[PDB]
């Protein structure tokens, strides 16, 4: 059968206004591979974003890790949307810093 | 280094 | 500590959307070296680790004559087993295989790995033995049965016992300044209050490598497992790692209650409390 994907929305360094950083998305526990995730700044998806190689973990659903750099400030607003065969509407999760 | 297969090996 | 060396293969086909893609990834510990995808514009096999980077022309025609190989293996692999099911051609279905051998702290072979899954669904799996094979239905003892003719267990053994372990001990020399070297977490704890008398303790791992980690709130000297929220250790990008414990208590109680961290990395097993 099919697995719906774990999201976790973090920065990789603690987050700073003004200073740079980078956006991670990591989806993990999925089945199907077949996965679209997209980084959103205030609504609007951000262009350059980049993901890891597919692969998988020892129950054999798969993981990814998609980044993007960016400059966390105090009202911009940064969340993940994803989209799996799971999933009835895409999945928008918000980034929370203390997460 | 990855296991090389022996030719036309399949499931 | 320990290593492992493993390949990960995905094989996936897609009726109406050309041939089966075939992925394949290498790993030590928790570094990946190099990658392959029969989907890129020139299929071959790159580096992913800065110390592979070393290795010569014919390291990596070797391994994209073998990824080459599979993609096309995989392919007919997909075929059959969609025929060993009576699953029809309309579908989307997914080969993954993992194998690999484990060393244990002195450098010898612990283990090795040979192991097979269908749609997310374990398939076949070569014994610890690596002799025998292990068939989860009767289509998987299709699958025995071949590879018991073309004597598989016997060449998967020659390559874990032999090659596997060979190559990782080479991996770990040229990236002794990365894969031998355990980043101790960076920690502390958080404190959020969610009414008038509970609040909420987080304690954060940052930093780390590799992945392997206990994070444990205690109450009184007494593990809280079935209270504490526990993340997934997620990749920071950098190849370190993150992860967060978190429980609810009651105002007032926070000195009552303590994280522990067991790293690899540390000197010592960490204690740590809330710091107001």
């Given at each position: 059968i099919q697995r719906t994907p774990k999201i976790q929305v973090y920065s990789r360094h603690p987050a700073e206004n003004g200073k740079s950083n980078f956006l991670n998305c990591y989806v993990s526990?999925?089945?199907?591979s077949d996965i679209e995730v997209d980084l959103l700044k205030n609504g609007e998806r951000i262009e350059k974003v980049e993901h890891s190689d597919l692969s998988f973990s020892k129950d054999w659903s798969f993981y990814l890790l998609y980044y993007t750099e960016f400059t966390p400030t105090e009202k911009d607003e940064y969340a993940c949307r994803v989209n799996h065969v799971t999933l009835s509407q895409p999945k928008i999760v918000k980034w929370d810093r203390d997460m | 280094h990855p296991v090389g297969e022996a030719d036309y090996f399949e499931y | 500590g320990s290593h492992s060396m493993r390949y990960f293969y995905t094989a996936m086909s897609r009726p109406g959307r050309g041939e089966p893609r075939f992925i394949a990834v290498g790993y030590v510990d928790d570094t990946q070296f190099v990658r392959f995808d029969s989907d890129a514009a020139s299929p071959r096999t790159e580096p992913?680790?800065?110390?592979?980077?070393?290795?010569?022309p014919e390291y990596w025609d070797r391994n994209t004559q073998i990824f080459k190989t599979n993609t096309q293996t995989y392919r007919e692999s997909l075929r059959n087993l969609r025929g060993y099911y009576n699953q029809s051609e309309a579908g989307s279905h997914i080969i993954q295989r993992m194998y690999g051998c484990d060393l244990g702290p002195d450098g010898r072979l612990l283990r090795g790995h040979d192991q097979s899954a269908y749609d997310g669904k374990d398939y076949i799996a070569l014994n610890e033995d690596l002799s025998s094979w292990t068939a989860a239905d009767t289509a998987a003892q299709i699958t025995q049965r071949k590879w018991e003719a073309a004597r598989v267990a016997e060449q998967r053994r020659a390559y874990l016992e032999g090659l596997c372990v060979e190559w990782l001990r080479r991996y770990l020399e040229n990236g002794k300044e990365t894969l031998q070297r355990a980043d101790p977490p960076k920690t502390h704890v958080t404190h959020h209050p969610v009414s008038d008398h509970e609040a909420t303790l987080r304690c954060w791992a940052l930093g780390?490598?590799?992945?392997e980690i206990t994070l444990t709130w205690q109450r009184d000297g007494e593990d809280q497992t079935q209270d504490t929220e526990l993340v997934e250790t997620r990749p920071?990008?950098?190849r370190t790692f993150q992860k967060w414990a978190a429980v609810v208590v009651p105002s007032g109680?926070?000195?009552?209650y303590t994280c522990h961290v067991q790293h690899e990395g540390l000197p010592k097993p960490l204690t740590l409390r809330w710091e107001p």
């Open positions: 526990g999925f089945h199907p | - | 992913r680790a800065p110390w592979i980077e070393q290795e010569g780390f490598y590799p992945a920071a990008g950098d109680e926070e000195q009552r």
